[PDB]
Every structure is written in structure tokens, then in C-alpha cells.
Amino acid sequence: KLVPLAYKQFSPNVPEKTLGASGRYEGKIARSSERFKELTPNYNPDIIFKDEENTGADRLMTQRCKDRLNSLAISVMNQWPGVKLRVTEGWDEDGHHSEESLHYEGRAVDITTSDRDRNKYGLLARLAVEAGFDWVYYESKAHVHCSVKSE
Amino acid sequence: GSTPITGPHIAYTEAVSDTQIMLKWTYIPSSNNNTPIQGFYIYYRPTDSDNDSDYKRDVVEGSKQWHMIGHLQPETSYDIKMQCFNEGGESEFSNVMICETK
Ligand SMILES: [Ca+2]
Ligand SMILES: [Ca+2]
Ligand SMILES: [Ca+2]
Ligand SMILES: [Zn+2]
Incomplete structure (x- = not known):
């Protein structure tokens, strides 16, 4: 039932910031801002943070993001014995993402498997959809x- | 010449080829009381590595506000960060950018 995504595919196949997907950017969250408080650190041992x-x-994210990420951590370990989910970017303050990136409000993660096997990433992506x-x-x-x- | 404390801020990183990445930073000399700056150290490591000892370093002159890193591998993500320095020592690191060659 699990069909990997192809390189450059996104799911659902609509723009990220539409209602059916992740919705609109609500503004950058900076470290000193009042809104920083709605991010909490994910300290799940099932997840490697770069x-x-x-x-x-990288640990900082919204509650919805944490819940989905923790589910994905499980399914990665179930799919590939001894492999774990790895997060390269969570909430970001470095500033290299797209303008109005959801990373800037802790609503996005960039991920790999712990073994950096490029040919696991299509299936990792499908696991994230299912998570x-x-x-x-x-x-x-x-x-x-x-x-x-x-x- | 007090050692710099505050480091540069990398404004952007962009691939120029399959082996080269451009970075541009801002450094405001007043930020370290106009201590003289001998140059900058630019560090880069493949993003697949999480070993902070695996950064390679380029040395750039103190007047520059951009640099092209070369001799990189095609279609490869790098982590990039930098310091400023003088005879006294080195600043803390800049923000850390992630950027892929073409
Ligand atoms: Ca990161
Ligand atoms: Ca970051
Ligand atoms: Ca550390
Ligand atoms: Zn991302």
C-alpha cells in the first residue's frame, strides 16, 4: 500500500500554503518574540537532530509538528531495522529557506534516514504522508x- | 586589537556551479569596537556529516564581504558557517547555512 514519492513530488499535489495542505504563513517566529513560547523542544530519543x-x-516545533514527527519516528524504525529518523532542520533562525518558509514558525522539518541512504527518501516521504x-x-x-x- | 567577539552574519548562500557556492555576509566593525580584522574563516562540511570536526576551512582577507567556495562535489549539500579573526583571536560562529551545489 506504501508507494514512494518520486523526486520533486509533493503530496497532496497542491501548493504547500493552500487550505488543503499546510495553509498560510502566519509570520516569522524569532527567539525573543512573544510567539517563541508556542514552540517546544522535541527530546524524543527515537529521533536524531542534526x-x-x-x-x-532543530528540536523546536509546534505541537502538531511534534506529534506527526513522533509518529513518523516510529514508522521509520518499523520499516528499516536499526534505522532512525533524522532531522536536519526544524524551526530555523539561520535564514536559508524560502521567503515565508514554514520553517520560520516551527511548522516544517527537513529529514533523512539516519544512514543517509538517498534511495530511502521516496519511501521516507510516503511514511511522512501516512504519519x-x-x-x-x-x-x-x-x-x-x-x-x-x-x- | 581586542579579539573579535560577535561574528559575521551570512545573508545568503547560493550555488554557482556543480563545484562552487557563493556566500555573502555582513560584518559591522563597530560590533567589536572597530577592532582591526585580519580576515574571515569560512567553514564548510557535507550536510551528511554531523561531526563538527569535519569542516574544511578557507581563509579570506578582512575587506571582503563575499566569497566563492570551490572544489566541492556535484549535487551535494554543505553546511556553511564562518568567523572573523585578528591577532587576538576568533569570533563566535555565524549562523549556519545549508546549500547544495548544482
Ligand atoms: Ca539544523
Ligand atoms: Ca537552521
Ligand atoms: Ca553540539
Ligand atoms: Zn524544509
């Missing part, structure tokens, strides 16, 4: 982008 920032930013992410995009050969609706 944290190249050495700030813990309930509101939009999943096989954005790069190097990672999958997944996002969620606002709370």
Missing part, C-alpha cells in the same frame, strides 16, 4: 521537507 547550529533549534504531515515534498535528493497546519 543541530549543526549547536543551539538546539499525517499536512504536506510532504521530496524537495531535494538530499532530504524530504514535511510541514503542518497551524494549531
Whole structure:
């Protein structure tokens, strides 16, 4: 029943910021802002966080995002023995994503498998759809982008 | 020449080819009391690595506000961050950008 996504495919196959998918950008969330409080760190041991920032930013995400990510962590481990979900980007303050990226409000993650096997990513993406992410995009050969609706 | 404390901010990173990535940063000299700056260190590592010892380093002159990293691998994601320095020492790292060659 699980059909991998192809490179560059997104599901549902509509724009990320439409109602049927993740909906509109509501504004960047900065570290000092009142809105920063609606992000909480995901400390699930089932998930590897890249944290190249050495700030813990990658762990920060909305509740809806955390719930979907934790479900996906499970299905990754079930699909591939000894492999775990890895998050390269969560909430972001570095600023390299698209203008009005959902990363800027903690509603998106970029992910790989822990073994960095590029040929697992199409199926990883399908697992993310089944885990309930509101939009999943096989954005790069190097990672999958997944996002969620606002709370 | 006090050691710099505050580092540069990388404004953007963009691939120019299958082996090269352009980065442009802002550095405001007043941010470190106009201490003289000898140059910048630009660090890059394949994004598949989470080992902070795996960054390679380019040295750039202190007047530059952009640099092209070359000799990279095609269709490969890199983590990119930077410091400024002088005889006293080095700043903290900049923000960390992620950018793929073509
Ligand atoms: Ca660390
Ligand atoms: Ca990150
Ligand atoms: Ca980031
Ligand atoms: Zn993303």
C-alpha cells in the first residue's frame, strides 16, 4: 500500500500554503518574540537532530509538528531495522529557506534516514504522508521537507 | 586589537556551479569596537556529516564581504558557517547555512 514519492513530488499535489495542505504563513517566529513560547523542544530519543547550529533549534516545533514527527519516528524504525529518523532542520533562525518558509514558525522539518541512504527518501516521504504531515515534498535528493497546519 | 567577539552574519548562500557556492555576509566593525580584522574563516562540511570536526576551512582577507567556495562535489549539500579573526583571536560562529551545489 506504501508507494514512494518520486523526486520533486509533493503530496497532496497542491501548493504547500493552500487550505488543503499546510495553509498560510502566519509570520516569522524569532527567539525573543512573544510567539517563541508556542514552540517546544522535541527530546524524543527515537529521533536524531542534526543541530549543526549547536543551539538546539532543530528540536523546536509546534505541537502538531511534534506529534506527526513522533509518529513518523516510529514508522521509520518499523520499516528499516536499526534505522532512525533524522532531522536536519526544524524551526530555523539561520535564514536559508524560502521567503515565508514554514520553517520560520516551527511548522516544517527537513529529514533523512539516519544512514543517509538517498534511495530511502521516496519511501521516507510516503511514511511522512501516512504519519499525517499536512504536506510532504521530496524537495531535494538530499532530504524530504514535511510541514503542518497551524494549531 | 581586542579579539573579535560577535561574528559575521551570512545573508545568503547560493550555488554557482556543480563545484562552487557563493556566500555573502555582513560584518559591522563597530560590533567589536572597530577592532582591526585580519580576515574571515569560512567553514564548510557535507550536510551528511554531523561531526563538527569535519569542516574544511578557507581563509579570506578582512575587506571582503563575499566569497566563492570551490572544489566541492556535484549535487551535494554543505553546511556553511564562518568567523572573523585578528591577532587576538576568533569570533563566535555565524549562523549556519545549508546549500547544495548544482
Ligand atoms: Ca553540539
Ligand atoms: Ca539544523
Ligand atoms: Ca537552521
Ligand atoms: Zn524544509
